Short mmCIF file of C-alpha atoms in Angstrom, two decimals:
data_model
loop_
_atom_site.label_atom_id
_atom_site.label_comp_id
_atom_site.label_asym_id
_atom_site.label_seq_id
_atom_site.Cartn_x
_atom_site.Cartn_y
_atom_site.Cartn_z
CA UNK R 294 22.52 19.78 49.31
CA UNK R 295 19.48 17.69 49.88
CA UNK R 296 19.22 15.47 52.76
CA UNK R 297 19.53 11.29 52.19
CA UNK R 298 15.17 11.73 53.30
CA UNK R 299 14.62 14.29 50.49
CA UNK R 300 16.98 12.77 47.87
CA UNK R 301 14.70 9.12 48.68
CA UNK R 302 11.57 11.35 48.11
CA UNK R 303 12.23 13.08 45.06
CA UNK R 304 13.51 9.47 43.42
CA UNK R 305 10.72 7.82 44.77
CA UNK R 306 8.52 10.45 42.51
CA UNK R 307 10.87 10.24 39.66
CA UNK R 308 10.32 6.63 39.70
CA UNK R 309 6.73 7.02 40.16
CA UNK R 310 6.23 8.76 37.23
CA UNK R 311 8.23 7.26 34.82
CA UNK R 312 6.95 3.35 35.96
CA UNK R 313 3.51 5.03 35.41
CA UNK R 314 4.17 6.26 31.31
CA UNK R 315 5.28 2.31 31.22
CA UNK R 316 2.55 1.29 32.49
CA UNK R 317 0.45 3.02 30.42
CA UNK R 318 2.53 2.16 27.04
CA UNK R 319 1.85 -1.70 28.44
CA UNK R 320 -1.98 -0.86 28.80
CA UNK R 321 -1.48 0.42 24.70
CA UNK R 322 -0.92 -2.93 23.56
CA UNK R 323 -4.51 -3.32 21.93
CA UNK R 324 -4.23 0.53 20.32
CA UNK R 325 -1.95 -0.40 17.23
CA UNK R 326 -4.71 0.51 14.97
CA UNK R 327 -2.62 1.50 11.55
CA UNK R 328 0.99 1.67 10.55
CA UNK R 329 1.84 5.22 11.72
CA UNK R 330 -0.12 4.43 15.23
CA UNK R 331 1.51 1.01 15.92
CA UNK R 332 4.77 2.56 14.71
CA UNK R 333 4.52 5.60 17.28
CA UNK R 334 3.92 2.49 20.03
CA UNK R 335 7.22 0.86 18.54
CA UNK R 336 9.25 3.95 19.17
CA UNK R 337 7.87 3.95 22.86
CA UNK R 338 8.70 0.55 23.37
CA UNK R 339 12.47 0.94 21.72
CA UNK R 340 12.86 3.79 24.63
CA UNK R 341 11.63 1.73 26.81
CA UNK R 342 13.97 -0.99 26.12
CA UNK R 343 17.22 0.91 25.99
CA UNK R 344 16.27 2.54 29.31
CA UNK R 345 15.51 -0.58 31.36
CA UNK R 346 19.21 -1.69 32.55
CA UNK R 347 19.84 2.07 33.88
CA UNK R 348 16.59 2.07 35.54
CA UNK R 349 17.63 -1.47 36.91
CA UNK R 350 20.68 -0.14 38.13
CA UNK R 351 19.13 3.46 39.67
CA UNK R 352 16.29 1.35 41.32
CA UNK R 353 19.68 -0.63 43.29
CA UNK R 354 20.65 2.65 44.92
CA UNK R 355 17.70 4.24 45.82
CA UNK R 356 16.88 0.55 47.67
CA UNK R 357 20.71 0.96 49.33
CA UNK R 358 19.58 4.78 50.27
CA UNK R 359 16.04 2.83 51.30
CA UNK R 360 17.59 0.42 53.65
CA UNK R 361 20.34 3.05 55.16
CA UNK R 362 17.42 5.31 56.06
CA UNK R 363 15.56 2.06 57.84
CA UNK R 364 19.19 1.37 59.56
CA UNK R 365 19.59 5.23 60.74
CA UNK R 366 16.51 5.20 62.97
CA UNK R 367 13.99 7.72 60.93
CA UNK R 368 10.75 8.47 61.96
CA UNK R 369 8.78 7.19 58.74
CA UNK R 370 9.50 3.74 58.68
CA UNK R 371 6.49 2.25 57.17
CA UNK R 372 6.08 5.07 54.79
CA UNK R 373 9.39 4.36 53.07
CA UNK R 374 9.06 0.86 52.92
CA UNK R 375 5.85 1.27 51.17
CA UNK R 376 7.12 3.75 48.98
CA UNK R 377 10.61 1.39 48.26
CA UNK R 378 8.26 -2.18 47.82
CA UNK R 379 5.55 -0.42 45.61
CA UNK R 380 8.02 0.98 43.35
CA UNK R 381 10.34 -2.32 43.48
CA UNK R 382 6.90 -4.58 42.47
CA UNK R 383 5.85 -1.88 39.76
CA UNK R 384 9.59 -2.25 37.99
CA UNK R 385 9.28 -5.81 38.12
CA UNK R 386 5.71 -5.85 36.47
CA UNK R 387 7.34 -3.82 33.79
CA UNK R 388 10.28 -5.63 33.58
CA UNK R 389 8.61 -8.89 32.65
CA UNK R 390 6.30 -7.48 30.24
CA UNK R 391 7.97 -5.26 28.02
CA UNK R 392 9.27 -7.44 25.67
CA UNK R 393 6.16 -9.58 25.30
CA UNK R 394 4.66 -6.20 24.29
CA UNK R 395 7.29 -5.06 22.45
CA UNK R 396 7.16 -8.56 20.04
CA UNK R 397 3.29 -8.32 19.68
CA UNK R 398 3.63 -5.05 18.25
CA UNK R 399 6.70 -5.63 16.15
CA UNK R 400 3.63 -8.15 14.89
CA UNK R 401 1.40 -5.78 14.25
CA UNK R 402 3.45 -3.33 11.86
CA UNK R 403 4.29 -6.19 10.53
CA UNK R 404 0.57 -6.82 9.39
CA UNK R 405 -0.16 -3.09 8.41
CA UNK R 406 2.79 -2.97 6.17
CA UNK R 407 2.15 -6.88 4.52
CA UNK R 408 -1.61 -5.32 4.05
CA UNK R 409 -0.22 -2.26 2.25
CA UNK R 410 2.40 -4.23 0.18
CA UNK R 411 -0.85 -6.95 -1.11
CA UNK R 412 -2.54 -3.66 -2.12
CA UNK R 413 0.25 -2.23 -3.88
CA UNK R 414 1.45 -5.65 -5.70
CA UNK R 415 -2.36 -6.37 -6.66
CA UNK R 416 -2.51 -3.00 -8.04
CA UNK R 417 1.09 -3.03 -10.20
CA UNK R 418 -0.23 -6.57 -11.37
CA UNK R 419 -3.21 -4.93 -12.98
CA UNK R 420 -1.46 -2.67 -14.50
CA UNK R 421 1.25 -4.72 -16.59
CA UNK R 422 -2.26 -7.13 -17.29
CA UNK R 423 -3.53 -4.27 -19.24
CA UNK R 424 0.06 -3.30 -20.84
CA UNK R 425 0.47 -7.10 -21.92
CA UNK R 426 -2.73 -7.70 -23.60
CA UNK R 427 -1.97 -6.73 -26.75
CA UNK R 428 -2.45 -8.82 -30.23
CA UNK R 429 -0.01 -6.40 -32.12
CA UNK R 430 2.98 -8.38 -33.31
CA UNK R 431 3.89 -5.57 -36.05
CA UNK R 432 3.00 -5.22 -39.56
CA UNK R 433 6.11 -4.39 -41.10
CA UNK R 434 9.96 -4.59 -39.80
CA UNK R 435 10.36 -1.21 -37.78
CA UNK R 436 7.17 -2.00 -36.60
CA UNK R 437 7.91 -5.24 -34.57
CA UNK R 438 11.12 -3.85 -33.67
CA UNK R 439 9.43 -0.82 -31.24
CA UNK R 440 6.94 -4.26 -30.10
CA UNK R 441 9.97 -5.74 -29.17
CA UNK R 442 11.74 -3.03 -28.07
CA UNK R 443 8.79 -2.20 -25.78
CA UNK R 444 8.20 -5.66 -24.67
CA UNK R 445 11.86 -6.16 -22.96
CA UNK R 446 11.43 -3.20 -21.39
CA UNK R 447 8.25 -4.47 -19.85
CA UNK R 448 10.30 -7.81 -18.63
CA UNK R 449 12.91 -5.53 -17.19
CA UNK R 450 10.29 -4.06 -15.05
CA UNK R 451 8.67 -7.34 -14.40
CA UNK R 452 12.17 -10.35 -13.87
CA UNK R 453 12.95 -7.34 -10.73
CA UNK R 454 9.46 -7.84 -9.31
CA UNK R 455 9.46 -11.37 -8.45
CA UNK R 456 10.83 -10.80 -5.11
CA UNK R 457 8.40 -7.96 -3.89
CA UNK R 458 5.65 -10.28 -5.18
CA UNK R 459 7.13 -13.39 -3.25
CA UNK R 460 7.78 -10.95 -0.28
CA UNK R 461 3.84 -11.14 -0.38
CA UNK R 462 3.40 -14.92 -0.19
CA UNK R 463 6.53 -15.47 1.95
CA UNK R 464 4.95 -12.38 4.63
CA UNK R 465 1.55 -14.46 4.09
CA UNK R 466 3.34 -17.72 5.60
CA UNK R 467 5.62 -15.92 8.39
CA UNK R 468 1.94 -14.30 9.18
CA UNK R 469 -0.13 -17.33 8.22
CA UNK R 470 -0.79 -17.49 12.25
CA UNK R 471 -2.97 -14.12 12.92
CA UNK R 472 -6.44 -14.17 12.30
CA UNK R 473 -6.69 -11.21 10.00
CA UNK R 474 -4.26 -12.96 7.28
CA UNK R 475 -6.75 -16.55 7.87
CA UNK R 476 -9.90 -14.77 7.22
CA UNK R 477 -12.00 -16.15 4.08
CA UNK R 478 -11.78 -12.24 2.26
CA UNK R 479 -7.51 -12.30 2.73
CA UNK R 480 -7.38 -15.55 1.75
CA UNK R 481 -9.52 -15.12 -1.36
CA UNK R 482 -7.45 -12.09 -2.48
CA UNK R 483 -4.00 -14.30 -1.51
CA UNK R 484 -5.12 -17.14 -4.09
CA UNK R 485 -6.28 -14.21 -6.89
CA UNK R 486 -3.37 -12.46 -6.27
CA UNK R 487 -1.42 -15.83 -7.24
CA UNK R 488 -3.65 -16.18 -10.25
CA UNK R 489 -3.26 -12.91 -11.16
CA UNK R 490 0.93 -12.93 -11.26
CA UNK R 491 0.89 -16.17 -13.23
CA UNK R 492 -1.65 -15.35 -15.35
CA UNK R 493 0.27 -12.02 -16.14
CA UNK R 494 3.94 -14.43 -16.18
CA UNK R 495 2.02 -16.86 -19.19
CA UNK R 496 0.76 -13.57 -20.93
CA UNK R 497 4.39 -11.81 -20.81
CA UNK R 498 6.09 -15.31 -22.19
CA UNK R 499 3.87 -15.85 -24.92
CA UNK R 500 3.92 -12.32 -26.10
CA UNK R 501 7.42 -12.31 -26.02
CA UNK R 502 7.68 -15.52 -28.20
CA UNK R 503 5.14 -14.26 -30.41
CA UNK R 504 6.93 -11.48 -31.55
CA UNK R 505 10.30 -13.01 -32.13
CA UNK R 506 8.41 -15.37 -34.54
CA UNK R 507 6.54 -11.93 -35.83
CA UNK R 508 10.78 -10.39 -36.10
CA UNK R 509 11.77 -13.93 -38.11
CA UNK R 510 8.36 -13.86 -40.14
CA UNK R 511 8.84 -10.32 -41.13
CA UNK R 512 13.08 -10.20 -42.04
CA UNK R 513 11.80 -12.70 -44.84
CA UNK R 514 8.88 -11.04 -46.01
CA UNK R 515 9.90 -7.49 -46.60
#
């Protein structure tokens, strides 16, 4: 039953409010600090996104209410075209900056999560280094046969990593433009990481032919 004056007020404060959490997510953009904290921003910008067009559309009729209360001769003129202007200017801030914010931290989980993947990949590299250094190419028949048994396992886990290794160097180039990725300590790791796969690739090959010359060796002399 509220009156067009008290329907104007109450959206005026709705609008107030909720151009005011906005503008505070916008003033965010600096606070992505780790994954879970730049992902918590993400979700506030995804909100923000999908709500925009119906906010668009609400902030049409409560200027149409605006300018029929101006029309009907009311006693608060210039409060309710301040109220109506500051709101309109505030949307339009938001408006045009929301998706710039949006992309920039869409960047930076981006970054957290290549940073976590180069730790992870650097550390499953130095484990297969230590499971491929080996100078056992069997003794005796059965013998080579568990090596080589053993040893395609270890290239089944290794021919399905080449992907999440080049999802490292391909992240690296599609990130290549941040400073955090150029500095001298990132890009140190980036070339030993590179070293470190095809160091592990020529160990895992030469094993491997190693110990089908150990299988041929050993068929003739047992």
């Amino acid at each position: 039953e509220a009156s067009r004056q008290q329907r104007f007020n109450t959206s005026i404060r709705d609008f107030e409010f909720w151009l005011s959490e906005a503008e505070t997510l916008l003033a965010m953009k600096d606070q992505a600090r780790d994954l879970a904290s730049a992902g918590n921003l993400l979700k506030k910008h995804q909100l923000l996104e999908r709500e925009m067009l119906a906010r668009e559309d609400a902030l049409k009729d409560l200027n149409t209410l605006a300018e029929d209360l101006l029309s009907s001769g009311t006693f608060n003129v210039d409060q309710i075209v301040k109220k109506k202007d500051n709101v309109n200017k505030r949307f339009l801030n938001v408006q045009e900056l929301a998706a710039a914010h949006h992309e920039k931290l869409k960047e930076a989980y981006a970054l957290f999560q290549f940073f976590q993947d180069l730790d992870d990949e650097e550390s499953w590299i130095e484990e297969k280094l230590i499971r491929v250094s080996s100078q056992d190419y069997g003794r005796d028949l059965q013998g080579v046969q568990n090596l080589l048994k053993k040893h395609k396992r270890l290239e089944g886990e290794l021919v399905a990593h080449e992907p999440a290794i080049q999802n490292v160097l391909d992240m690296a180039e599609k990130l290549k433009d941040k400073a955090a990725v150029g500095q001298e300590e990132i890009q140190l790791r980036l070339a030993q990481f590179v070293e470190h796969w095809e160091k592990l690739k020529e160990l895992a090959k030469a094993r491997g032919l190693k110990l089908e010359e150990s299988l041929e060796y050993l068929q003739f002399m047992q």
